[PDB]
Amino acid sequence: DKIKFKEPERCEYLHIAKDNKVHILLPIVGGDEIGLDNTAETTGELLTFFYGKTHGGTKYSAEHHLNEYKKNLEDDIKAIGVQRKISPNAYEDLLKEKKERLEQIEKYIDLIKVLKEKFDEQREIDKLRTEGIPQLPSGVKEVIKSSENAFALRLSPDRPDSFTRFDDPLFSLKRNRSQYEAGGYQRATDGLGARLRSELLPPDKDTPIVFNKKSLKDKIVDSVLVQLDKDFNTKDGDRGQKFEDIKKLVLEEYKKIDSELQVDEDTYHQPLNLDYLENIACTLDDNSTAKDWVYGIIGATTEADYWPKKKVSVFYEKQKEIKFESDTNTMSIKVQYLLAEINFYCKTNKLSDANFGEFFDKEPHATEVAKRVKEGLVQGAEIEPIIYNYINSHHAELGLTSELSSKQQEEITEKFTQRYHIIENSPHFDEFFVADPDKKGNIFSHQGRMSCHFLDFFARQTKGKYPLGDLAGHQEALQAGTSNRLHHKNEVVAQGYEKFDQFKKEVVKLL
Amino acid sequence: LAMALKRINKELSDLARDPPAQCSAGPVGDDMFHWQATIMGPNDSPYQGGVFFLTIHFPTDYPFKPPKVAFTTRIYHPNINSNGSISLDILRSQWSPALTISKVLLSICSLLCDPNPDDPLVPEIARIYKTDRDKYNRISREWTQKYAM
């Protein structure tokens, strides 16, 4: 008989190695690759971990879970024992394997008590429950400080919350003064956030910033006009000539877009020039501007129906425009969060130790970026490449030895999108804890928690003092290991009794 | 879109200063893309005396397309129908920028004075033009008097 075992296949905070090592994982914050908790709410998982439900209810503490996990093992070993009376060699390994787990689960329990009883003199743990807005324990902070695969990123929202809790942000921008700081809310006059505001902040309630005010030809026409001088005319000197100069410039632009296009003939094949349009087509005259000249040329030289005949970046999302102040803030955060992701990629891929945000706060760059994002928005340009291009133009100031391949950029835009979506409803955008679990690092994803090894924290929180004993191998053990995404079920315990029933019920599905 | 709005204003300032004796056209309201025109039947035709209105609807890419010209006024003619629609090469295939809205009107004049039944927009009337002019005339004259005076 297959005993009904009580050892759970899932337990809070409990991974098990291929090799039957139990790892307890101390939760820093909810999430997979990007933290779902920030600012004042940051220490909530730690609070839960260490004291369960002493505030609010419906979530148990680690000691509690382990202490029931312990009991379940105690009960299974009896039942196996009881079975071995009738069938001497029954459950031979499973019995060894469970005693093994038990021993470690007991040692983790000890360590947690020890931490609370003999090492909380400062009260870093205890404050998780007393204080209103707890700090991360220094141990956790020191883990995060040293991480190679996880970084805090800090933004500049329009109404910042000063109660940020991630101390060493890889990326950071100059912020406004919070309502919760001495002197109260105050917008900064300088810094990327300030310029994004001023540049994407529409002039009034009646007149927004709309996202496609450029026909392809509108774009072309602009392209041609910038070429001419500050002082250029339609009515001075040799006019036929000027029109020739401008045909040229039009012609130029026709090539970038399309091969079939030509400027010698009107749709009718007749010689096109200033006499021709001023006299025969009669589309131009004395009071035409040079702008008119261009359109005229375009108009003469192309059918109209074959201009409209010439995937969705996170910046255009059912929004056709920026109407409200809220709309402008959002957009700005989006630009920032992108800069942030770029920096995380560059850092985690060993491209660059820099704080990018520190550079985009600076006098020329802050302003250009803002203006350039605004411009792209009115054209309908992909915004992402604008930012990638700027970084690539400046990459040495930004601590990079070279530019970012199209490949690299495609990847960045990818995560940027995944993650942004994931956080887009956060009540606060002040800061985010980001981790890449496909890399060598002290931070892990498990059960939707971004997590330190309990013992990594224990080492640091005790500064070496109390000794790990049998558990002293475990941290480095989980580190060898193909990933940092830890399966949410312990396959070694479950053992695939469940897979056998996943099956039995598909054979019921046939009748 | 100002390209045409500059062109039309030309053609209007042309027709204003020197009108045709037997034709006339202009816009209604501040809209410059919808015109109204009048041809008066020629003096060697059953349509003589009578006055026919048309509507000229210009396009946004004029003069690089033709205008839509059609009779508002009923006319018993082989090349014009109850819809109002004229059939005239220069409105369809032979259009050019060189062509004024006047020259259309002029061509619509000749069409009445010199009707062509081999391009019949209304075969019933075309049958009758080619087999009995007296019958054609008496009718095309009666229609001129009823609907165009």
Author numbering:
A (entry chain A): 6 to 315, 323 to 523
B (entry chain B): -1 to 147
Pull verbatim passages from the article behind this deposition.
The Legionella effector protein SidC and its paralog SdcA have been shown to be required for the recruitment of ER proteins and ubiquitin signals to the LCV during an infection. Our previous work has further shown that the SidC and SdcA are bona fide Ub E3 ligases. Although SidC has no sequence or structural homology to any other E3s, the catalytic SNL domain of SidC contains two lobes, a smaller INS lobe that mediates the binding with E2 and a larger main lobe that carries the catalytic cysteine. To gain insight into the molecular basis of the ubiquitination reaction catalyzed by SidC/SdcA, we determined crystal structures of two SidC/SdcA complexes: a binary complex of the SNL domain of SdcA with the E2 UbcH5C and a ternary complex of the SNL domain of SidC with the E2 UbcH7 covalently linked to ubiquitin (UbcH7~Ub).
The crystals diffracted to 3.0 Å and the structure of the binary complex was solved using molecular replacement using our previously determined SidC (a.a.1–542) structure as the search model. The SNL domain of SdcA, which shares about 72% sequence homology to SidC, has a bilobed structure containing a large main lobe where the catalytic cysteine (C45) resides and a smaller inserted lobe (INS lobe). We have previously shown that the SNL domain of wild type SidC forms a complex with E2~Ub, but SidC lacking the INS lobe fails to do so. In agreement with this observation, the binary complex structure reveals that the INS lobe indeed mediates direct binding with the E2, UbcH5C. The overall structure of the complex has an elongated arch-like shape. Strikingly, the catalytic cysteine of UbcH5C (C85) is about 80 Å away from the catalytic C45 of the SNL domain. This structural feature indicates that a drastic conformational rearrangement is required for the INS lobe to bring the two catalytic cysteines within attacking distance for efficient Ub transfer between the E2 and the E3. A comparison of the SdcA-UbcH5C interface with that observed in the SidC-UbcH7~Ub complex reveals common structural determinants for E2 recognition. Both SdcA and SidC apply a similar surface area of about 950 Å2 on the INS lobe to bind a region around the conserved E2 loop4 phenylalanine (UbcH5C F62 and UbcH7 F63), which is the pivotal residue mediating the binding with HECT E3s. In SdcA, this hydrophobic pocket is lined with residues I285, A286, and Y273. In the SdcA-UbcH5C complex, residues K4 and K63 of UbcH5C form salt bridges with SdcA residues D287 and D305. Moreover, the R5 side chain of UbcH5C H-bonds with the main chain carbonyl group of A286 of SdcA.
